[PDB]
C-alpha cells in the first residue's frame, strides 16, 4: 500500500551537493572558535562514517533480502543516496572549509574513536548477521537501520542545525537539511518493513522482539551519551544534545510501531528554527484540400 508513494517521494527528492554553492559559509566558519570548528568537523566525520556503512552495507543487504522489484528499487535508490550523495556531500563541506591536513586528521580520528567504532561494530554486525530466508535476522537488522536513520544521526545533525538556526553556516546547513529530509523518509520506510515482519510473529515472539529492540536502543543510547559528551563538552552543549537524541529515539521507536521510551523535554528553540513535438505520420488525405 505504500512502496509506490515512497518510490515517487524518493526520486522527486533527488539532489547533488554541487547544486549548493558553499563559498558563502567561508566567513561564518572563519569566525567560529577553534573548539567550535573541531566539534563541527568531528560531528560531520561521524555522520560520514554512518552514511558510508549505510550505503556500502546496510541498504544493499536489506535490498537483497526484501522481496519485490519495487521494494528493491526503493531500497537501492536509498542506498545510492547514502554513499553517492550523503557521504560525498560531507567531503564537499570539508574541502571548502578546511585545509587538507585538518581533513586528513579528522578521518584518522574516526578510525581511532572508540564510540564511533563501537556503534559501527554493533550496527554493521547486525547487517552481516542477516540469514537468507530468515525473517527474524532481517527484522533485527531493520531495527538497527531505523536506529541509525532516526536516532544515531541526530547527535551529529544537532550542530549544523544549531548554527543554521542562528543564521550561521547556512549553505552547509542547507545540505544537512536535505540529508535530514532523506533520512526521515528512509527511517519511516524501513520501519514499515520491520513492522511487517514483527506482525507475522506469535505474541511470545513479539515480546522477545520488543526486548531486542529496547535492549539494543539502550545499549546504543549509553554509547551515544559518551560520544555526545566527548564532542560537545568543549562547546558547552552536551546536555542540550542529549535532550535532542532522546527526542529522536522516541521517533525511531514510533517508526517501529512502539511506544515512546523517554519523557518529553524542551529542545533548544534555535535547533527548532534550524528545521520535442509529437510525431504523427502524414495521411494520404493530408495532401488534398
Amino acid at each position: 500500500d505504500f512502496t509506490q508513494m515512497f518510490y515517487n517521494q524518493n526520486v522527486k527528492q533527488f539532489w547533488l551537493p554541487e547544486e549548493i554553492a558553499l563559498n558563502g559559509d567561508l566567513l561564518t566558519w572563519k569566525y567560529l572558535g577553534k573548539n567550535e570548528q573541531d566539534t563541527y568537523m568531528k560531528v560531520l566525520a561521524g555522520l560520514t562514517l554512518l552514511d558510508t556503512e549505510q550505503g556500502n552495507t546496510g541498504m544493499p543487504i536489506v535490498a537483497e533480502h526484501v522481496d519485490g522489484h519495487q521494494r528493491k528499487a526503493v531500497l537501492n535508490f536509498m542506498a545510492m543516496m547514502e554513499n553517492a550523495v550523503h557521504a560525498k556531500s560531507y567531503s564537499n563541506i570539508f574541502m571548502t572549509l578546511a585545509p587538507t591536513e585538518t581533513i586528513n586528521e579528522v578521518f584518522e580520528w574516526v578510525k581511532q574513536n572508540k564510540y564511533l567504532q563501537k556503534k559501527a561494530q554493533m550496527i554493521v554486525g547486525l547487517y552481516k548477521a542477516i540469514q537468507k530466508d530468515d525473517e527474524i535476522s532481517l527484522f533485527k537488522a531493520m531495527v538497527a537501520s531505523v536506529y541509525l536513520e532516526s536516532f544515531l544521526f541526530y547527535s551529529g545533525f544537532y550542530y549544523p542545525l544549531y548554527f543554521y538556526g542562528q543564521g550561521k553556516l547556512m549553505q552547509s546547513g542547507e545540505i544537512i537539511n536535505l540529508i535530514l529530509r532523506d533520512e526521515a523518509i528512509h527511517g519511516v520506510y524501513v520501519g514499515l518493513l520491520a513492522q511487517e515482519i514483527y506482525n507475522k510473529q506469535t505474541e511470545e515472539k513479539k515480546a522477545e522482539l520488543r526486548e531486542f529492540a529496547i535492549d539494543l536502543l539502550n545499549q546504543l543510547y549509553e554509547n551515544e551519551l559518551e560520544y555526545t559528551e566527548d564532542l560537545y563538552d568543549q562547546v558547552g552543549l552536551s546536555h542540550d544534545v542529549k535532550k535532542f537524541i532522546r527526542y529522536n529515539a522516541n521517533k525511531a521507536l514510533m517508526n517501529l510501531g512502539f511506544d515512546p521510551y523517554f519523557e518529553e523535554e524542551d529542545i533548544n528553540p534555535i535547533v527548532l528554527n534550524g528545521l520535442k513535438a509529437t510525431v504523427e505520420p502524414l495521411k494520404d488525405d493530408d495532401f488534398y484540400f
Binding site: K276, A277, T278, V279, E280, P281, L282, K283, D284, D286, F287, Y288, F289
Partner: protein, 683 residues
C-alpha cells in the same frame, strides 16, 4: 527605477478591470522630458548643428552639399512643422536606442526623429528640395519607413551599407567556395545578412578529378561558412548571420537537415547559419502519391547533361535522372523527409521552406533564370546566375547575385491619408535611389546584379494593426478582401512608377524584353479579373481613393509595353523587425504574437501594448497563436498574388499540434500558392 518605465509598468495594473493603456502616453512624455531632452545636444541654430556633424565625421558632406542651407533649413522646418509625437514609450525608446545618432562616446543624443527623417529625405532627394520635402512629409506622417540599414545609415559617414540582404550562388569548385567564403565575410562585415545556394555543390562521396568518395559534401562548406560568419560578426554586437539553401533533391539533404538537430555533434552542427530547403512541385507530388523519391548526386547530373541540377526543371527531368544509369541517385522516402522537415521546424524553426514551383509559375524573369533560393529572411525571390570564379591568373565569369533595398509602407497611415499612389511612387523613387547609390566593391556579382536588375523591395506593415483598429478580424474574409484590393493597388502603382522611371531614364532593367512585363503575360489576371473590394465595409475603407479597374490595368499594360520597366522586382514583404516599434505598427503583414508585449532591457522590465490596442478592439487583436494557420495561409496567399517577390511567412504553432499539423499547414501553403515559409514559431 526610471520614472518613465515605472509609468510604463502601470499599464498592467488593472484599474476597474481594464489595462491602463493611457499610461504609455504618460510613460513616453516622462521618457522625453526626463531623459531625451536632457541628453539631447542642442545647438544655437541648425547651421551650427550641421557644421558640427559634418566636421566631426558624423555626416557625409557630399549629399549635404547638393542643397543650399536655405533648402536644408526648409526641409528641417517641414519635418518639425508636423510636431510628431511618439504614441508609446516603446516607439521613442527603440528609436533613440537603435537609430538616433549619438556622440562618439555613446553619451548624448545628436539626432531627434525629425533630424533623422530630414537627413534621410535629403539623402533620398539627391539635390531636389521639393522632393526632399515630399520625403519628409512621407516619413514624418509615417506612411513609408525605409529599412533599418537605410534609415540607420542614410547620410552618415561611418556607416554600413544601405542593403542588408544578399543572395550568393556558389559554383561547384574550390575557387568558387573560397570566393563564396570571402564574399560572405565581406558582406557580413558590411552588416548584411548573406544567403548562399549550396545546391550546385556536389554531394558527399563524389569524385574530385577521378578520385572517388573525395568530396565532403555541402556540410563541409556549411561549416566553413558558419565559421566565416562567426568571424565576421562586427564586434559581436550583431553576430554574422548567414543562410544556406539546398534543393530537396540534393543527395546531401538529410545531412543538410541534420546540422540543425539538437543531438547533432560539434563536427556537424552549424550554429550561426540558418538553413532553407527548396522544394519543387515534383517532391510534393511524390510525397502525395507515397511513391519512392530519389535524391541525386549533382556532379553526376552535371557531367551527364552539362547543366547543374538546380538549373534544370525537376518536374520534367526527374524521370530522366532516375532512368539515366550514369546519374547517381539515392532512394529516399519523400513522406519521411516531409515528416523530418516538420519535426525539425517544430524543434528548431528550421529549415525555411521555399516552394520552387510556386515562386517560378508567377516569376516574371524566368528567361534570365529561375528562382532557386531565398534570402536569410526568406522573402527575396529573384533570378540569379552563378559566377565562375577561376584561378588567380584567369578572368572570372561574373554572374548575378541577388540584393534588394527594403522599404515598408505603413498600411494604417497610408490608408488614413488616402495616399497609396503617392506613397508607393515616392517609396519606389527612394528605393531606386538607394539601389543607385549602392556599390559593393568586394562582391562582383552583387554589384553587377544591382546595376543590371535594379531590384527593389517595397513591403508593408501594420496590416493586422490596421484591421484590428478598423474592427476587422485577421482571419475574416473581409480582411483578405482588403488585402487583395490594397496590394493590387500597391502593385499597380509600383508598376506605374517603374514604367515612369524607365521612360524618364530611357533605360529598363537588363533582359527586360524577355520578361513577362514585356510580353504582357504578367498583366493577364489584372486585365481579366477585377480586384475591387467585394464587401461594402471594405469598399468604404477605400472611399476617396481611386481603385484601378480592368481598363486602368489595360492602360498600364500598354504603358509598360511601350516604355518598359526599370525594376526587375519591386515588391517584397520583409519581417520589418525593429522599425515596427518606431512606426508604432505591427510587424509586417503577419498577425500579432502578443497583445501586450513584455520585454526586459538590461535590468529594466517594460511592456509594449500593440499599436491602438484598447478595450473596444481587444478581441480584434487576436494573437497569432490562437488563430487558424489555414486562414493565415489564405491571407498571405491573397497578398502574395500581388507581390512579385516573396513574403516572410512565420508559422505560429501551439504546443498541442503535432508534426502532422505542421506538415498539413505546409502542404496547404503549397496548395494555396505560398512561395516561402519563414519560421515555425511555437508558443
Amino acid at each position: 527605477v526610471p520614472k518613465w518605465i515605472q509609468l510604463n509598468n502601470e499599464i498592467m495594473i488593472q484599474k476597474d478591470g481594464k489595462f491602463q493603456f493611457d499610461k504609455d502616453k504618460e510613460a513616453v512624455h516622462s521618457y522625453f522630458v526626463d531623459y531625451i531632452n536632457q541628453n539631447t545636444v542642442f545647438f544655437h541654430n541648425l547651421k551650427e548643428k550641421l557644421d558640427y556633424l559634418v566636421e566631426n565625421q558624423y555626416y557625409e558632406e557630399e549629399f549635404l552639399s547638393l542643397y543650399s542651407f536655405e533648402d536644408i533649413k526648409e526641409v528641417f522646418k517641414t519635418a518639425y512643422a508636423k510636431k510628431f509625437r511618439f504614441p508609446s514609450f516603446m516607439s521613442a525608446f527603440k528609436f533613440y536606442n537603435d537609430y538616433a545618432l549619438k556622440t562618439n562616446d555613446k553619451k548624448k543624443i545628436l539626432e531627434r526623429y525629425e533630424d533623422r527623417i530630414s537627413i534621410v529625405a535629403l539623402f533620398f532627394a539627391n539635390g531636389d528640395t521639393e522632393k526632399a520635402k515630399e520625403y519628409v512629409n512621407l516619413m514624418i506622417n509615417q506612411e513609408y519607413q525605409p529599412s533599418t540599414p537605410t534609415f540607420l545609415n542614410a547620410g552618415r559617414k561611418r556607416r554600413g551599407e544601405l542593403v542588408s540582404c544578399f543572395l550568393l550562388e556558389v559554383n561547384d569548385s574550390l575557387n568558387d567556395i573560397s570566393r563564396a567564403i570571402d564574399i560572405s565575410m565581406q558582406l557580413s562585415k558590411l552588416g548584411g545578412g548573406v544567403s548562399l545556394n549550396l545546391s550546385k555543390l556536389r554531394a558527399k562521396g563524389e569524385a574530385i578529378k577521378d578520385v572517388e568518395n573525395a568530396t565532403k559534401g555541402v556540410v563541409g562548406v556549411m561549416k566553413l561558412l558558419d565559421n566565416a560568419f562567426r568571424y565576421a560578426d562586427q564586434m559581436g554586437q550583431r553576430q554574422g548571420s548567414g543562410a544556406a539553401y539546398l534543393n530537396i533533391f540534393h543527395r546531401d539533404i538529410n545531412d543538410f537537415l541534420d546540422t540543425k538537430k539538437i543531438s547533432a555533434d560539434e563536427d556537424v552542427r552549424v550554429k550561426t547559419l540558418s538553413i532553407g530547403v527548396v522544394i519543387p512541385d515534383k517532391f510534393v507530388e511524390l510525397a502525395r502519391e507515397d511513391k519512392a523519391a530519389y535524391v541525386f548526386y549533382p556532379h553526376t547530373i552535371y557531367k551527364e547533361y552539362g547543366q547543374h541540377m538546380d538549373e534544370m526543371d525537376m518536374n520534367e527531368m526527374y524521370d530522366k535522372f532516375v532512368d539515366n544509369p550514369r546519374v547517381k541517385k539515392e532512394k529516399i522516402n519523400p513522406r519521411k523527409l516531409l515528416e523530418k522537415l516538420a519535426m525539425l521546424r517544430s524543434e528548431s524553426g528550421y529549415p525555411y521552406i521555399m516552394f520552387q514551383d510556386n515562386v517560378n509559375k508567377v516569376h516574371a524573369n524566368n528567361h534570365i533564370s529561375k528562382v532557386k533560393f531565398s534570402n536569410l529572411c526568406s522573402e527575396v525571390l529573384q533570378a540569379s546566375q552563378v559566377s565562375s570564379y577561376t584561378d588567380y591568373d584567369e578572368e572570372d565569369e561574373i554572374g548575378l547575385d541577388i540584393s534588394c533595398n527594403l522599404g515598408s509602407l505603413n498600411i494604417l497611415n497610408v490608408m488614413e491619408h488616402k495616399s497609396i499612389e503617392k506613397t508607393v511612387k515616392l517609396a519606389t523613387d527612394s528605393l531606386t535611389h538607394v539601389s543607385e547609390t549602392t556599390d559593393i566593391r568586394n562582391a562582383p556579382a552583387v554589384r553587377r546584379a544591382n546595376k543590371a536588375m535594379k531590384s527593389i523591395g517595397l513591403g508593408a506593415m501594420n496590416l493586422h494593426g490596421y484591421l484590428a483598429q478598423n474592427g476587422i478580424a485577421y482571419e475574416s474574409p473581409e480582411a483578405r478582401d482588403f488585402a487583395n484590393t490594397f496590394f493590387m493597388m500597391v502593385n499597380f502603382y509600383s508598376i506605374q512608377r517603374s514604367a515612369e522611371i524607365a521612360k524618364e531614364k530611357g533605360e529598363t532593367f537588363d533582359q527586360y524584353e524577355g520578361s513577362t512585363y514585356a510580353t504582357g503575360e504578367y498583366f493577364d489576371k489584372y486585365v481579366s479579373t477585377d480586384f475591387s473590394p467585394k464587401y461594402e465595409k471594405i469598399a468604404n475603407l477605400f472611399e476617396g481613393m481611386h481603385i484601378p479597374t480592368t481598363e486602368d490595368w489595360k492602360k498600364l499594360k500598354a504603358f509598360v509595353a511601350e516604355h518598359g520597366m526599370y525594376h526587375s522586382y519591386r515588391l517584397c514583404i520583409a519581417p520589418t523587425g525593429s522599425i515596427s516599434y518606431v512606426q508604432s505598427s505591427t510587424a509586417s503583414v503577419m498577425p500579432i504574437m502578443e497583445r501586450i508585449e513584455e520585454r526586459t532591457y538590461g535590468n529594466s522590465k517594460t511592456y509594449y501594448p500593440m499599436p491602438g490596442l484598447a478595450s473596444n478592439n481587444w478581441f480584434f487583436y487576436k494573437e497569432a497563436y490562437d488563430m487558424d494557420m489555414f486562414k493565415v495561409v489564405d491571407m498571405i496567399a491573397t497578398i502574395q498574388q500581388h507581390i512579385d517577390q516573396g513574403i516572410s511567412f512565420t508559422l505560429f504553432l501551439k504546443d498541442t499540434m503535432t508534426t502532422r499539423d505542421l506538415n498539413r499547414i505546409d502542404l496547404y501553403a503549397h496548395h494555396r500558392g505560398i512561395k516561402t515559409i519563414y519560421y515555425a514559431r511555437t508558443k
